[PDB]
Design a protein around this ligand. Structure first.
Ligand SMILES: [Mg+2]
Ligand SMILES: [Mg+2]
Ligand SMILES: [Mg+2]
Ligand SMILES: [Mg+2]
Ligand SMILES: [Mg+2]
Ligand SMILES: [Mg+2]
Ligand SMILES: [Mg+2]
Ligand SMILES: [Mg+2]
Ligand SMILES: [Mg+2]
Ligand SMILES: [Mg+2]
Ligand SMILES: [Mg+2]
Ligand SMILES: [Mg+2]
Ligand SMILES: [Mg+2]
Ligand SMILES: [Mg+2]
Ligand SMILES: [Mg+2]
Ligand SMILES: [Mg+2]
Ligand SMILES: [Mg+2]
Ligand SMILES: [Mg+2]
Ligand SMILES: [Mg+2]
Ligand SMILES: [Mg+2]
Ligand SMILES: [Mg+2]
Ligand SMILES: [Mg+2]
Ligand SMILES: [Mg+2]
Ligand SMILES: [Mg+2]
Ligand SMILES: [Mg+2]
Ligand SMILES: [Mg+2]
Lengths: 144, 192, 276, 113, 120, 63, 103
RNA sequence: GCGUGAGCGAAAGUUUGAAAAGCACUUUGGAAAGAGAGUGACAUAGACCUGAAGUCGUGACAAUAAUGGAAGUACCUCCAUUUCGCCAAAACCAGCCUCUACUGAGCAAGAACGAGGUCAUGGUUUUGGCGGAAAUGGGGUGCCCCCACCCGUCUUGAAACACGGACCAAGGAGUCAAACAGACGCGCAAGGGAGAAGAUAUCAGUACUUCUCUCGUACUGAAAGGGAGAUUGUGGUGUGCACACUUGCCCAACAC
RNA sequence: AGUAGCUGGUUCACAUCGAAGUUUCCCUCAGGAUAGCUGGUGCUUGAAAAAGUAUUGUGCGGUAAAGCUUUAAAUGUGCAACUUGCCAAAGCAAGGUAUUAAGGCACCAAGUGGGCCUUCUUCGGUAAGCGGAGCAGGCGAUGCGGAAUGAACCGCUUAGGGAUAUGUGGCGUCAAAACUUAUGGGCUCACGAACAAUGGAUGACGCUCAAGCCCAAUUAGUGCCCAUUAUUCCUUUGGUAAGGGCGAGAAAGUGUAGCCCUUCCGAUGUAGAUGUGGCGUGGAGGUAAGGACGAAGCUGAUGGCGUGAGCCUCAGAUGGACCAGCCUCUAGUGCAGAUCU
RNA sequence: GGCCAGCGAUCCUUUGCGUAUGAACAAAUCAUACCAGAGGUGUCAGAAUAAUUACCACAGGGAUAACUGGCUUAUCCUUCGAUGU
RNA sequence: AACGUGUCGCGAUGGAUGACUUGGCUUCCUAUUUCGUUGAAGAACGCAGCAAAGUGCGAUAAGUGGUAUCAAUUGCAGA
């Protein structure tokens, strides 16, 4: 909306907020990120400290599909289990089963206090997840 | 003809009217503006000012964080004292991380469909500020709460990163772009 | 793309007692030496030439688009809002005005015109026929020559109803299975007059769902919960439960006699002391 | 009783035929008027605001209210000592005959009847 | 509710007549054409008006009982504090004005008989 | 040019902000370490008895 | 670049824009809706034209490739010769009866 | 039209009127034209809708560096309103203001009585004056006294012997896109959102949806890789709204 | 449409606040980035971590003066009001059971980054209306009153007005005031009244028992005049200020023609920031209405309204057919200045 | 380390050190990476840089000379969209 | 007095403005859609009863023929 620009407010105030002195020019410094190592050095170093340099090994032709390992925590397995199905899950009884590929997750990080058992079914697991998941009386079953 | 030096600097900036276009906030401010003025209660004065805040400054609360803060409050209550209403001037959001929660009586502007169902699955009421005023016209054992805003990802960006004390998050579409050798980095810690 | 700029032009430089705007060259013409290209010049370029890639269209969240069709139907159920926006609803039997299903069985247009007088809708259709005039301003030479007011929006159960109600000017038709917020709130103001057909109306919760039950057509959509369970705040404020908790000339004081005698009651006992 | 009865005219409107008399706030460091030298023209400011209960009140004592047709007159039926209908310039002399013999019957005032 | 409706129609409606910055209501049912919630009777659950009806004072009324049935939501009754006695029967607070309009409706009716007769 | 004129004025506009109170950023860290490490051993034990204390108060409050 | 603003990398340093000077490189979608009808008309124009015949030919259920997707079961591109054999169909007969083949 | 040329390249609305009915005829003139007459609803609609500014002519009028400000007054007002109320003057009340003591004749000193002033102070009228005009207001023109350095501009500094500035009209300059960010509004919220596309009903819109994708809920390491609850629940502690109870719990929040 | 750290221009009003010409860095020095200054947004709670000030207590100092490179100011300146190490060991250590004034914190962002003068202190320079610093105040950005005149001197700083009273400066005329006051003292004859050349400057005249100078005064051994200042009154505006209230009106309200009333404090302002039921333009969705009994446009001693941008009405002895209002949307949207076209 | 001055980014090279990568798999080579030094930017917060123009040119500048008045006895105050030696 | 200045009334000059708009711009679509040695596109010169330009045409020249259509074209004339 053109109505709302302060272009429209300062119609009449000759320099549109750019100042009578120190006039609004063009590129008072360079285009874009020019002088990132010169006259804008104080700026990138304050705000974008790691910006200049090289840090690690290259990975030519990265393929992220093979790398795809999205994670769900134990603390979040209620998102997958039906609330109705999850209603009664004693550790010594029957358990909801939760395929994680179906739900889009690959590894199972063992974050918070799981307490309702489930037979999580996932490609990967944390050291602490399979442990927690067992101590709750559930069980991860490895899949692919 | 007056020293005014330091007077303007003491001027405070406060909202005196909601920017919300929502009609219901305005009927809700209409209530607590009244109720805050016509009652001596400090609860109505808080619900009324918070109700005037930005949705930024009205951060949502986890139902998880109500169940925690509530039982932690109510556990000490002497027997035969029913627990305080859990008022919040903001949305109340469901928490997957807490499957089972106490029969809470939360009162908030808005509830997630998940919070509202878990809240009633526990048998707790999910009442609005309308009947909050009709049940607790004064903040009588209400338990006014706020949602968190420090973990908000906007504030992770506050300050510079490059400044030595700081752990500000630099702005970057590219996570690997401003990555840096351990040698070259700002000192992590620094005393104020 | 290239208007105003379609010339050969160069500034004559400085040192020629002329502004350094580019000047059309050559000779033998009126435009020679004429300024060119700049936004200020004749025949020259517009400041920021308009582009075909302005953001012309918008995204609205599917839910807000729905929140809105909900709120504008709910806004049409309320006769104050609906007569507030312009409609002549004074003859209308009731609001919402749901109506017999065979109203879409009409073939002849004047079968339908008979129908509109029956439900009292014709006074808001007369509102429209009379509201019709040549548009003010330029829009008239841009295929907008006639503007007229929005009238009642008949809402058919399904596509088969229209025929007689086509042509019957000032009577927009609507389909329950595709209600348009551009029609539900003309001007963007809620409160349009809607003649629901009985068939279109009974399936209006099959479409939008309950507060407690999902729409059968709109997925997991479900009517948004009121922020206020008791939407009249003034009735609360006047309620007895709430009423219970409510909280229940001289300038110169030295020389004025009455002022001083008031600030200093003893002053007259003191002035009596002064005598002597 | 008005603060200022004069217009706040633009500086040097009198020398330049093109300039409208309508006010523009002076700018330029060296403007005699915005530097507010005493012999210069005044600038409008909050201090020239009219007294607020006599404000908008025409010397008739009525606040003018626009009128376009005979129905508008009833918008002034009950507050006819406060508002005075001023019939719009473009209503026909036709219609004004109707507004006027009705603005007479109702005791509502009209600025241009 | 009316608290909500008024907050909807308040910024614009057919009835608001914001002319010259003055704001009067074209509302048939408002008594002093003041664009106010107290008066916006087209909006109110209950409403009262004391318009003329051919020499006679008319006192249209709107108890809420009719609800939303516009064809019969308003109930006229032809008929000086008595008219106010009728208007307070539905809206008690409107009565003080409903009396004063009901008077001014009378002086208008007397004034125009003097004017209509003088137009001969 | 290096004049320091208008600087203490420009500085006292928002005052000289007075320094942070001692009870705030009272990090140790670079404190002589051996003391600092024994302090952790005590503070950690304060925590186990703070929590153990609250467990007491509740059990006491079941009466 | 004054302030906390992220370093901007707006790749528009080529003459994509259309001005007096350049015929720009721009792909607007203003005809998106018209095309949606065109295809829609044309698929309907086609199914009418071949009434008995299914709008789309039979396709295999194939596994998706990588680990990211091997769980997914997309529609394939025509049956294997071994599949057509086992189903008893003739592989060069199959396309003529609307079965896609994929050697 | 321009340029040897390659090439450059205008301005122009026949928008009189419904229709040409486009001014026959008389009259003066060598004519152009003029005066009548005529057409048309209009010809200050005449080959031309509108008909601005600026500029000029003319009549009448006020008058005697410019402009300008303030305030009056003279004259004029095709203006407004009001009155058949307006101008005054006096009073009353209130307000307000002004105009002994000590000391050794003096002060470093305190009130009182009395009187005055005043509505550009408030309330109480009274009494007169004026009433096709009067009256208040506005407007116009002149004068008087007084005030008053040409504006825009960059500049420490502009009235500058610094730049730009004859008049007027039309035009003329923070735009569009995109990527981020903060803030604010809205929607839903541990999820949010779609996009491309499709399917449908009726119109580049609205309605509808699959499948996906995308940002997020998990971070870290160069990387292989690994990946976070406490001792049915705020990890503790400090300071901490509200509420509760006469201290508790502390929300957020900061700090440790 | 090359680029321009450069030059020039950049169009409504009003209200709210309002700078900087300095720090670090830059092939930087006519520019940036950076921080400060400023605005906006808040947040947080309300003598929290208040203070360009003293006092008191406790440090610090080595300049002036002194002294012959040493004692030592004043102005300043800081500050204050059970578990687990050590010890030989359980005791020590550590963590635990005066005046005034709303404090702190965050976020985003601008302008600015030529300064100048003066005060005092200095440094350099023979000297300068000179270069350089320290301090503070100013001008810049700011009038007003005064010094005849003056960017920065003096007084005072500023909404629209009235009364009162002042400040600096005056009181012979100019010029308000000693209608040339003193019932004051001295001094003075020729000049006399803060910061070599166009004729001519106590400001001018003129003054001389002054109308000069020093001193004192205020009706006399028995004062007055003039401010944008102060005080007070009226009005406005702002307050994210304090309360009360809910013949026509009485709206639960940021903001309008403000729901009403009451009280209080503020008001300048360049760059800049922000607000505005702020103005205005072409278009669109609405609504409402107008027009051949004359739309738009244009003209206007047409008045009226609004602080204002402006709106409205009147009149056209103008026009000839379109179109204002209101809410929402939109933009190729507001022009005295560009050696602008 | 010899109090206090004596020294330096990114990229790159190089050296060391203890595993990691070279992504169909595997070892060796090679290269890369992490990590810690070194080679240097003395214009020392860091382009790799000769003159000339009176044939000259542009954008500006009175921010800055000559010139022009002023001040002083050189300053840089006016003037570089021009004030004729 | 005069000139000059100024207000007002008329009038001229001027061509804004407003309304108008068979034009432009932009978007979208459709198809039995893509020139030429069988002489293309371009250029030239011509053709009407009065016709310069523009348009149409090409010595069959503001057209011949086929088709539909109809009673015109229209400045004057002409059929
Ligand atoms: Mg400004
Ligand atoms: Mg700015
Ligand atoms: Mg700049
Ligand atoms: Mg500069
Ligand atoms: Mg990389
Ligand atoms: Mg978090
Ligand atoms: Mg053009
Ligand atoms: Mg042209
Ligand atoms: Mg500098
Ligand atoms: Mg004409
Ligand atoms: Mg200079
Ligand atoms: Mg994250
Ligand atoms: Mg400039
Ligand atoms: Mg200020
Ligand atoms: Mg410059
Ligand atoms: Mg010494
Ligand atoms: Mg010495
Ligand atoms: Mg002076
Ligand atoms: Mg005198
Ligand atoms: Mg101001
Ligand atoms: Mg436009
Ligand atoms: Mg005039
Ligand atoms: Mg423009
Ligand atoms: Mg350097
Ligand atoms: Mg100079
Ligand atoms: Mg020809």
């Amino acid at each position: 909306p053109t109505r709302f620009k302060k272009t429209r407010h300062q119609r009449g105030s000759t320099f549109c907020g750019y100042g009578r002195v120190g006039k609004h020019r063009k590129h008072p410094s360079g285009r874009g990120n020019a002088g990132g190592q010169h006259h804008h050095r104080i700026n990138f170093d304050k705000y974008h400290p790691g910006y200049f340099g090289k840090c690690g090994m290259n990975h030519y032709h990265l393929k992220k599909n093979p790398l795809w390992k999205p994670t769900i925590n134990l603390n979040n397995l209620a998102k997958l289990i039906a609330k109705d199905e999850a209603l009664k899950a004693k550790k010594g009884e029957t358990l909801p089963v939760v395929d994680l590929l179906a739900n889009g997750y690959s590894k199972l990080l063992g974050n918070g206090h799981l307490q309702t058992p489930c037979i999580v079914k996932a490609r990967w697991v944390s050291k602490l997840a399979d442990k927690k998941i067992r101590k709750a009386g559930g069980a991860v079953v490895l899949q692919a | 003809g007056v020293d005014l030096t330091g007077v303007q600097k003491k001027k405070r900036v406060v909202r005196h009217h909601t920017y919300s276009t929502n009609p219901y906030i305005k009927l809700l401010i209409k209530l607590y503006k009244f109720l805050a003025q016509r009652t001596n209660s400090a609860f109505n004065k808080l619900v009324h000012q918070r109700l005037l805040k930005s949705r930024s400054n009205r951060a949502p609360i986890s139902l998880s964080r109500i169940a925690v803060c509530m039982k932690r409050k109510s556990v000490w209550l002497e027997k035969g004292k029913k627990a305080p209403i859990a008022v919040i001037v903001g949305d109340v959001l469901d928490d997957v991380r807490m499957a089972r929660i106490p029969a809470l009586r939360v009162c908030a502007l808005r509830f997630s469909k998940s919070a509202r169902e878990r809240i009633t699955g526990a048998g707790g009421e999910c009442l609005t500020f309308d009947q909050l005023a009709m049940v607790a016209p004064t903040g009588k054992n209400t338990f006014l709460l706020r949602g968190r805003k420090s973990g908000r990802e906007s504030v992770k960006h506050f300050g510079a990163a490059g400044v030595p004390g700081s752990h500000a998050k630099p702005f970057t579409s590219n996570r690997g772009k401003e990555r840096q050798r351990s040698s070259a980095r700002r000192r992590a810690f620094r005393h104020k | 793309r290239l208007s105003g700029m379609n010339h050969s032009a160069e500034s004559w430089g400085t040192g020629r007692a002329v502004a350094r705007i580019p000047r059309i060259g050559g000779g033998g013409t009126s435009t020679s030496g004429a300024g060119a290209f700049g936004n200020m010049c004749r025949g020259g370029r517009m400041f920021a030439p308009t582009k075909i890639f302005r953001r012309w269209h918008r995204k609205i969240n599917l839910h807000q688009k729905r929140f809105a069709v909900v709120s504008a139907l709910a806004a049409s159920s309320v006769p104050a809002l609906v007569m507030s926006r312009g409609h002549k609803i004074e003859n209308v039997a009731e609001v919402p005005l749901v109506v017999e299903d065979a109203v879409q069985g009409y073939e002849k247009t004047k079968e339908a015109m008979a129908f509109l007088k029956a439900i009292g809708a014709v006074d808001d259709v007369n509102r429209v026929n009379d509201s019709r005039e040549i548009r003010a301003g330029r829009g008239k030479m841009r295929n907008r020559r006639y503007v007229a007011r929005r009238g009642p929006m008949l809402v058919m159960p399904d596509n088969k109803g229209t025929r007689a109600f086509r042509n019957i000017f000032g009577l927009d038709l609507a389909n329950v299975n595709a209600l348009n917020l551009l029609h539900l709130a003309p001007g963007g103001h809620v409160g349009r007059f809607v003649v629901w057909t009985k068939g279109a109306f009974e399936k209006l919760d099959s479409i939008f769902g309950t507060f407690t039950k999902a729409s059968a057509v709109k997925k997991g959509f479900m009517l948004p919960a009121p922020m206020l369970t008791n939407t009249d705040v003034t009735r609360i404020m006047q309620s007895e439960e709430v009423r219970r908790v409510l909280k229940p000339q001289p300038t110169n004081g030295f020389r004025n006699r009455r002022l001083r005698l008031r600030l200093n009651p003893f002053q007259k006992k003191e002035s009596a002391m002064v005598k002597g | 009783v008005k603060k200022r009865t004069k217009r706040f005219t633009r500086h040097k409107c009198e020398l330049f035929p093109q300039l409208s008399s309508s006010w523009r706030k002076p700018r330029g460091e060296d403007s005699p008027v915005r530097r507010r030298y005493k012999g210069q023209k005044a600038m409008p400011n909050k201090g020239y605001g009219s007294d607020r209960k006599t404000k908008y009140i025409t010397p008739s004592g009525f606040k003018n209210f626009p009128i376009h047709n005979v129905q508008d007159l009833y918008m002034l039926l009950m507050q006819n000592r406060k508002y005075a209908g001023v019939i719009s310039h473009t209503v026909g002399a036709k219609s004004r005959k109707a507004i006027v013999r009705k603005a007479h019957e109702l005791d509502v005032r009209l600025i241009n009847g | 509710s009316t608290d909500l409706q008024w907050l909807l129609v308040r910024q614009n409606s057919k009835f608001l007549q914001k002319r010259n910055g003055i704001r009067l209501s074209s509302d048939p049912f408002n008594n002093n054409a003041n664009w106010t919630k107290r008066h916006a009777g087209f909006l109110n659950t209950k409403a009262a008006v004391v318009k003329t009806k051919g020499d006679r004072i008319l006192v249209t009324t709107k108890d809420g009982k009719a609800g939303n049935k516009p064809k019969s939501m308003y109930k006229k009754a032809v008929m000086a504090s008595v008219v106010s006695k009728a208007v307070a029967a539905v809206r008690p607070d409107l009565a003080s004005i409903a009396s004063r309009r009901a008077r001014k409706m009378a002086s208008t009716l007397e004034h125009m008989k003097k004017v209509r007769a003088a137009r001969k | 040019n290096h004049t320091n004129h208008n600087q203490s004025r420009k500085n006292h506009r928002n005052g000289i902000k007075r320094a942070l109170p001692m009870y705030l950023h009272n990090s140790k860290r670079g404190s002589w370490l051996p003391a600092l490490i024994n302090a952790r051993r005590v503070r950690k034990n304060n925590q186990k008895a703070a929590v153990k204390a609250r467990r007491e108060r509740l059990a006491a409050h079941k009466a | 670049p004054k302030g906390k603003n992220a370093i901007p990398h707006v790749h528009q340093r080529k003459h994509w824009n259309p001005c007096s000077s350049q015929k720009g490189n721009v792909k607007v979608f203003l005809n998106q809706p018209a095309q949606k009808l065109r295809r829609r008309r044309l698929r309907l124009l086609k199914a009418k034209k071949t009434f008995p015949r299914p709008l789309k030919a039979l396709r295999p259920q194939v596994n998706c490739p990588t680990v990211r997707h091997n769980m997914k079961k997309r529609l394939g591109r025509g049956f294997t010769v071994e599949e057509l054999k086992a189903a008893g169909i003739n592989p060069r007969f199959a396309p003529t009866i609307g079965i896609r083949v994929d050697r």
